[PDB]
Ligand binder design. Sequence first.
Ligand SMILES: *[C@@H]1O[C@H](CO)[C@@H](O)[C@H](O)[C@H]1NC(C)=O
Ligand SMILES: *[C@@H]1O[C@H](CO)[C@@H](O)[C@H](O)[C@H]1NC(C)=O
Ligand SMILES: *[C@@H]1O[C@H](CO)[C@@H](O)[C@H](O)[C@H]1NC(C)=O
Ligand SMILES: *[C@@H]1O[C@H](CO)[C@@H](O)[C@H](O)[C@H]1NC(C)=O
Ligand SMILES: *[C@@H]1O[C@H](CO)[C@@H](O)[C@H](O)[C@H]1NC(C)=O
Ligand SMILES: *[C@@H]1O[C@H](CO)[C@@H](O)[C@H](O)[C@H]1NC(C)=O
Lengths: 595, 97
Amino acid sequence: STIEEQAKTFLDKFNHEAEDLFYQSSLASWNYNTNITEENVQNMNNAGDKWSAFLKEQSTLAQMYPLQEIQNLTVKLQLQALQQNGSSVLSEDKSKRLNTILNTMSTIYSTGKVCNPDNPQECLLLEPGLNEIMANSLDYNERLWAWESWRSEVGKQLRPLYEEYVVLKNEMARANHYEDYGDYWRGDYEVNGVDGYDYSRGQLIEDVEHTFEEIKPLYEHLHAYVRAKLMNAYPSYISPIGCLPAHLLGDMWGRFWTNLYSLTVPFGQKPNIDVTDAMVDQAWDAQRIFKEAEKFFVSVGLPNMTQGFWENSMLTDPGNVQKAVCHPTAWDLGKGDFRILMCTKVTMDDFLTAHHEMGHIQYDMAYAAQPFLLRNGANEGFHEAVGEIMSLSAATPKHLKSIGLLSPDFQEDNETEINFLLKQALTIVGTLPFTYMLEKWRWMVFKGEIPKDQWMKKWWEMKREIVGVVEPVPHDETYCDPASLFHVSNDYSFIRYYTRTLYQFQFQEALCQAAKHEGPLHKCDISNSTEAGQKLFNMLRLGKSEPWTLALENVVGAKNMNVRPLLNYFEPLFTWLKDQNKNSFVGWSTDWSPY
Amino acid sequence: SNKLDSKVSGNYNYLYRLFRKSNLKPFERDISTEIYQAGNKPCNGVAGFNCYFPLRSYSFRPTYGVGHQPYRVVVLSFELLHAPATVCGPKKSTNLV
Ligand SMILES: *[C@@H]1O[C@H](CO)[C@@H](O)[C@H](O)[C@H]1NC(C)=O
Ligand SMILES: *[C@@H]1O[C@H](CO)[C@@H](O)[C@H](O)[C@H]1NC(C)=O
Ligand SMILES: *[C@@H]1O[C@H](CO)[C@@H](O)[C@H](O)[C@H]1NC(C)=O
Ligand SMILES: *[C@@H]1O[C@H](CO)[C@@H](O)[C@H](O)[C@H]1NC(C)=O
Ligand SMILES: *[C@@H]1O[C@H](CO)[C@@H](O)[C@H](O)[C@H]1NC(C)=O
Ligand SMILES: *[C@@H]1O[C@H](CO)[C@@H](O)[C@H](O)[C@H]1NC(C)=O
């Protein structure tokens, strides 16, 4: 009779209707992705338009239900998320201009091709060739030219776009009773109405600062170690006291440092743990690889996947006649249907990618009982984090020996682990200063504290203190270098990569101690421990129904950000880094002495 | 009944009653199509705000999970009254000796 029962009935109508409409759009997207055809594109467009229109009308209906008198945690969560205006809070022209701005900068970056001058006959696009020109080349000038040319062309054609992008996104948030567009992204971690577990939108920056203050001491030795390693490759271009050149990061923005594993290898003679040759020798096809993962997922306690996955998921490239998306994507179509789009090859990475992607789908069946709108993770970081521990556990030598990939007589000495430890540190610890820095620049520019003519120099100054990477040359306001990133050029939150890093390591220790492991973190194999999976399933089964602070404390016991697990796993590397950094200079200086 | 009650485009011929003002009595059929009254405002025959059609059509397809595939259910109800029991089981016949 009251408003609340009306919302409950209204939500009941929405939940059943949305699932079928979501499935049709998801099925259209699945067909479009695995079969790129003209009819498939318009099918996704028509389904996507109907799905967008359905969300529009549902949001308008729910806005008539006040949030103040909603008494249980479940109902208010769905109505708060469903009442989100998005870009509709402003006028049509303002919304369309932002959407057009969103559309055009996506096209500019996707079609952004920078090539060598003086030969316009053919040019090299960003994806196929520009990726290899910085990840395998050893030429300082070639990397420098590619670094400067791409940001020069893209920055100039994105600077007017980024001027309106930051303002328009701020308009949408401020019209939605938000301080800025940065607070809009910070609202994912907001917890309100729950005692003890309450979390504030603005509390994220200081909490991330609290965990970051301990990341730098480990990163500083890593920074000194790579700089000493980079001295062999570049003797004079990089000063021992200065920062690293921006175009010698192995990638475009320095997010992943895995491209310097060969350059910064601690023991090049010592073999790695890779057993890729075992799969081809024993004829382990991708069909059986997923069986091995499925055999692994049932060992830890997760139930085996349904038979519908086999007849609906394509794990091999269709061929030349059919065009399918090779990007690793997990598909939760709804209504009990789960698929994974896989162009799997016979490689170690694809085996780890599969384990990473089944972790996404295995998370999906966990919250299947929850309503469709709540059929999501508690925060953005949980979904990827739970799949990362699956790859971490599957990458252990004990797991490889258990399933026969690695020989039981293999010697797991400390020499073959530090290089394995270093490679993970390059991928994980390397992105931590960069992820916080650009995002911290991103919230701050959303806040407006940064002067409109003081973005890059402030950005460059942060790179001197946070990541310790020096710029090739100073850049003025004509170029827009930050917008060159794939995520920012598509309105994608980047702090989620930072949170999933801590979540992955937080989950591991709680998972490992529940498995009763007497060894270090890098030797933790969660296999054959069904009790650990049940405790893991406790957070999995909650999904978005419970706050992330409550969900975190269910497993690890801490509702807030925790940096302690990260130091434990790299402790053998952290002490080892101190051994070889006695001659090198720990830390870095803001001076531009190198270049 | 996936092979029979499912179509690739969707078998919408099967409907279920999503809303009703009260729970059904045992062995009771409700085929009413009156718009459900979810709010205090009268429906007036219009499926608008807080007013929706009580019956929803199942979109059965052969590409669903085990729990969502159509299942034909035949329910047998047995009663004994003062009237003679005229429904018997088969009786076995043994060869004559
Ligand atoms: C992919 O699309 C083409 C063109 O419509 C069609 O001929 C083909 O049968 C499709 N393949 C599959 C597996 O649906
Ligand atoms: C609160 O109401 C919602 C309405 O659907 C219900 O799902 C939930 O279980 C209720 N919680 C409690 C503790 O009764
Ligand atoms: C969404 O927009 C409508 C009208 O533009 C407004 O009344 C409503 O308060 C907005 N939603 C929120 C959460 O502020
Ligand atoms: C999953 O495991 C259950 C119990 O062992 C079994 O009944 C079922 O057939 C299995 N399904 C698949 C697809 O392996
Ligand atoms: C491995 O341990 C042995 C024994 O303590 C030691 O001599 C050697 O230096 C260690 N090597 C590395 C790479 O830690
Ligand atoms: C875990 O169980 C599987 C299957 O029962 C077995 O092959 C594997 O050896 C077990 N792990 C260990 C460490 O014994």
